[PDB]
Amino acid sequence: DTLLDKLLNADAVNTVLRAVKNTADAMERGLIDTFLRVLLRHAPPCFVL
Amino acid sequence: SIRRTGVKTPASYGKFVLSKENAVTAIAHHAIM
Structure with missing residues (x-):
C-alpha cells in the first residue's frame, strides 16, 4: 500500500x-x-569413587 | 433554503491501511480467508 506498511511488515518479521x-x-x-x-x-562424588 | 444536493464525500478511510475493501468481512470470515 504505502511506504510505511513495508516497515510494519519489517517490524513483524x-x-x-x-x-x-x-x-x-x-x-x-x-x-x-x-x-x-x-x-x-x-555423577557420584569423586571422593566416593 | 435547505435543499437536497449531491455532495462529494470520500471513499475509503486509510491510504495507510490495507485497502482490501473487505476489511470487516474478511476478518469476520477469518476462520476461512
Whole structure:
C-alpha cells in the first residue's frame, strides 16, 4: 500500500524472528540445563569413587 | 433554503491501511480467508 506498511511488515518479521530467536536459544539452553542436571543426578562424588 | 444536493464525500478511510475493501468481512470470515 504505502511506504510505511513495508516497515510494519519489517517490524513483524523482526519480532517473529526475535521470538523464534528466543526459542532457538532457550530450547538449547534447556538442553544444556538438563544435560548438566542429569549429569549431576548420575555423577557420584569423586571422593566416593 | 435547505435543499437536497449531491455532495462529494470520500471513499475509503486509510491510504495507510490495507485497502482490501473487505476489511470487516474478511476478518469476520477469518476462520476461512
